[PDB]
C-alpha cells in the first residue's frame, strides 16, 4: 500500500535532520517534540508532509525521495515559524503560510544542486535558511496579521559577575545544546534525542556531545552573558558541524577528529559574529554558521594521505564508510 510507504518517507525525512536514516529514530524525535509543545510538533509535521508531497509532484529523483533527503527542510521551517510568533499557542491561521513556504524547499534545494555538483558538494541547510530569513524579514514585528517577536542590538556594556557562575547549569548546557537543533529547550527532549542518535550509530552521538561541549566552552572567552549559555543558544551550531566533518564526509581518523574540533570552534565564533551583525534587521541567526563553516572545510585540499574525502555517492554512515574505505 502506497500510504505506508509515504509515512515511512516522512519519518525518514524527520530523522534526517541529524544525518540519521532510520524510522525508529524518527518516532523518537516526534515523541520528543510532542513532549516539548504540541503546537510546534503539529506545525513541523505539517511542514514535512507538504514538502515531501511537493517534491513528489515536481518529479525529482526517486531514490532521493525514498531516502528522505527532501523532508528534512520542512520540519525545520515549520518549527521555526511556530517558535518566532507573538500571537501565542493555537493560532490556526499560521498554518496557511506554512503550506506555502514549505513548497519553496524542494525548488531551492534543486537549484543549488546544479551549482554545487561541479565541485561535488552537498546542499547542507541553505534552503531552510533562505526561506526562513525571507519570511521573517517580509513579515516583521509591525505587522497586522503575523507579528514576530523582538530582537534588538545591544546598547550598553553587559553586567557580569564571575562570582555567581553555577557549575550545575554550565554542565547542563550540553543536552539542551543538542536539543536546540529542533528549537526545543527542555533537558528531557535533549536526552531523548541523544538516545535516538545512539540507537543508530554511536559515533554520531559522541561527536554531537563533543561539539556541544566545544560550543559551550568557546563562548566563555568573549564574555557572553550567562543567560544565552544557559538557554543553550551558543551550542547548537557546533554539533552539526562536528558531526558533518568528523565521521560522515571524511573517513574517520584522529587527524579528522582534530579537524572536526577546529570546525566546531570556528563555527562557534562565526555564530557569535553573525548573531551580532544580523540583529540590526531584527532577524535571528539560524544555521548560517554551520553551513558556511562546513562548506569551507570541505573545500580544503591537503597532501596528507590520511585526510580522504569520500564521493557523495557512497556516504551512508561512519562505520560503513570506514569499512568501504578499508576494503578497496
Amino acid at each position: 500500500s502506497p500510504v505506508f510507504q509515504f509515512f515511512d518517507w516522512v519519518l525518514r525525512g524527520t530523522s534526517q535532520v541529524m544525518f540519521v536514516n532510520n524510522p525508529l529514530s524518527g518516532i523518537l524525535i516526534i515523541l520528543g517534540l510532542f513532549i516539548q509543545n504540541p503546537w510546534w510538533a503539529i506545525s513541523g509535521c505539517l511542514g514535512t508532509i507538504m514538502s515531501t508531497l511537493t517534491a513528489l509532484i515536481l518529479s525529482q529523483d526517486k531514490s532521493a525521495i525514498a531516502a528522505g533527503f527532501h523532508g528534512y527542510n520542512g520540519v525545520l521551517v515549520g518549527l521555526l515559524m511556530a517558535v518566532f510568533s507573538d500571537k501565542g499557542d493555537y493560532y490556526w491561521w499560521l498554518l496557511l503560510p506554512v503550506i506555502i513556504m514549505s513548497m519553496s524547499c524542494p525548488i531551492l534545494s534543486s537549484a543549488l544542486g546544479t551549482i554545487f555538483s561541479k565541485w561535488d558538494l552537498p546542499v547542507f541547510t541553505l534552503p531552510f535558511n533562505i526561506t526562513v530569513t525571507l519570511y521573517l524579514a517580509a513579515t516583521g514585528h509591525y505587522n497586522l496579521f503575523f507579528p514576530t517577536t523582538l530582537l534588538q542590538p545591544a546598547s550598553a556594556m553587559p553586567n557580569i559577575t564571575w562570582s555567581e557562575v553555577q557549575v550545575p547549569l554550565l554542565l547542563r548546557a550540553i543536552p539542551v545544546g543538542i536539543g536546540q537543533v529542533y528549537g526545543c529547550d527542555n533537558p528531557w527532549t535533549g536526552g531523548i534525542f541523544l538516545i535516538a542518535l545512539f540507537i543508530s550509530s554511536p559515533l554520531i552521538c559522541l561527536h554531537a556531545a563533543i561539539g556541544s561541549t566545544m560550543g559551550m566552552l568557546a563562548a566563555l572567552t568573549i564574555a557572553t552573558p550567562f543567560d544565552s549559555i544557559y538557554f543553550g543558544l551558543c551550542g547548537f551550531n557546533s554539533t552539526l558541524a562536528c558531526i558533518a566533518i568528523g565521521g560522515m564526509f571524511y573517513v574517520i581518523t584522529w587527524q579528522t577528529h582534530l579537524l572536526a574540533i577546529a570546525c566546531a570552534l570556528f563555527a562557534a565564533y562565526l555564530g557569535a559574529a553573525l548573531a551580532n551583525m544580523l540583529s540590526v534587521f531584527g532577524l535571528p541567526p539560524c544555521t548560517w554558521p554551520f553551513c558556511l563553516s562546513a562548506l569551507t572545510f570541505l573545500l580544503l585540499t591537503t597532501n596528507n594521505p590520511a585526510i580522504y574525502k569520500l564521493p557523495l555517492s557512497k556516504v551512508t554512515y561512519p562505520e560503513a564508510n570506514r569499512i568501504y574505505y578499508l576494503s578497496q
Copy 2:
C-alpha cells in the same frame, strides 16, 4: 550611413528592456517617457547613448551590439538616477555622473558573462542593480552636491481600515504596475507601453498583464499599506519574472504557464522581504527580486519532458521558439 545604423542600435537598446527587439516599440517607449517627464527622458536617452558608445569602444561582439543587448542598461540607470534626486527638475550638473556610471555597464555585463557561461545562463539586470546601488550608497542624503531622497525603516504599527478600500484604483494598479518598469507612474504611459508590447508579440503582453495582477494580489495577504499598492510599486518585479519564465526561455506550455505564475508569486514575496531589509541603509529595492527569482527558476532540473529549456543561441521570441522546437 553609419549614423542611421547607430540610432537604430540605440532604439533597439531602448526597446530591449521588456524583451522586445523592434525599433517601432522603441519609438513608442520614448513617446511614453516624454509624456511622463521630459527631464527623465533626456537622462535615459543620454545614458543609453553613452553605454552603447562605450560598448563599441571596448570592442565586444558585433552581433550583440547590433541586436541591442548593450543598451538596455543605460536607460534604466539614467532614469533611476533622475528619479531619486532631491535637487528638482533641470539640475544640469546631474548629467556629469550619468556619463561616468553608464560606462560601467558594458564592463560588468561582460565580466559576469564569463562566469554564467559555464551553466548557460543570461545576465538579466545585475549590472544596472550594482551600478545604481553603488551610486546611491556612495552619495547619500547628507551630501553637498547630489543629495538623494529619504527612505526610512518602519517604526510603528500601520493603520489600515478595510472599509475604505476602493475597487477602482485596485483594478487601476495593473497599467501603472506595468508602467513602473521604467519608473513612470502615469496610467497613460502604462497603456502606451502595453500597446508597444502588443505590436510585437501578444504572448509577452498577456504574460505581463498576468504578472502585474499576480503581484497586486500577492501584496494583500501581508497587509501592505494601500498607498504602495495604488502607486504600483508592488507589481513591477512580477511582470519581468513572468515574461522571462513563461514564454521566452522555456518553450510555451501550460506547465510552464503555472511555473511562471509561481515565479511571479515568489518574486513578489522576495520583493517585500528585500524592501524591508534594505531600508536600513537608505537604499530602495530595484530589480533585485526579479534577478534572483528568475535565476533560481532557470537552474531547476526536472524529469518531466514538457519542461524544455532552450539554448541561449536560439531564443528570439515565443512564437519563433515554439515553431523551432516543433520543427526538429
Copy 3:
C-alpha cells in the same frame, strides 16, 4: 640550517603585501613599521610567523610557502587587530586572539583556491578581509575583554568651506596614502615604503604613486570631508588595484595603463560606497573595494590583441613578464 630558511620565508611573506618578492624589501618594511609604533610591529610579526607555521603544518604546496604566498595575510591581520583597539598600547592579552585568527588564514586561502582555479584567478586578499570582519563583528565596542573603537554613520550635513583648502597637505596625501596600506600614517614610513618598492622594480613604484594620486583626486568630486583626505584613508585602495591591473597580471602596454587608471577610479568610488554602507554595523571598510574591483577587471574579455592576460604560472614581475611575452 632550517632556521635561516624559515626567517627568509617570513621576510618574503612580509614583503609580498605589495606584490614584491625580495628579503631586502622586507627588512625595509619592518624598519618602517618599527618607526611607526613598536607594538603594531610586534603584533604583525607574530601574526606572519604563526600563519607561516600553520601553513607548514597543514602541508600545502612547498613552492608557494617558499615564495611567501602564505605569509602576507598574517601581517595585515595582526596590524589591523592592533590598530582598532581601545585598551591602548601594550595590552599583552591581545596576543592571544592574534594567534588564533592567524591560523584561519592558511585554511581560507586554500578553500577559495579550489573555487577560483576554474577561471584561473588569484585569491587577492579575501582571507584577511573575512577574518578581520569576523573578529571585529564578534567582539564589538560593548565588550568586556577586547573592546573596539567606535564608528558611527553620518547624521548631519557636513560643513565644508572651500576657502580653507591647503595645497601643501593635499599634495602630502600621496606618501601617506601609499603608507596606509599597512595601517601607518606617518610620512616617513611612506617614503621608506616607496624606496623599498623602488629597489625591486620601478614600474610598481610608479603605478603606486599614480594610483594614490588618482584616489586622492577622485574623492574631491563628492565633497568628502577634508580630514579623511588628509589622513590618507581615501587613497590606499587605489594603489593596490592600479599595481595589480597595470603591470603584474597584464602585459604592460598603454591600453593596459589606461585600464589601470580606470580601475583606480572605480575602486575609489566603490570604496566610498562600502564605507558609507558598512558604518551601520560599526565595521570599517578594509581592502574589500580593491578585491572586488581587481576581480571584476580580470574577468573582462575583449577582442583587442594588445590586452593579453598572462597565465598564473608565469607572473613574476612586470619586466620579466614583458620579456617573456616578447620572446615567444
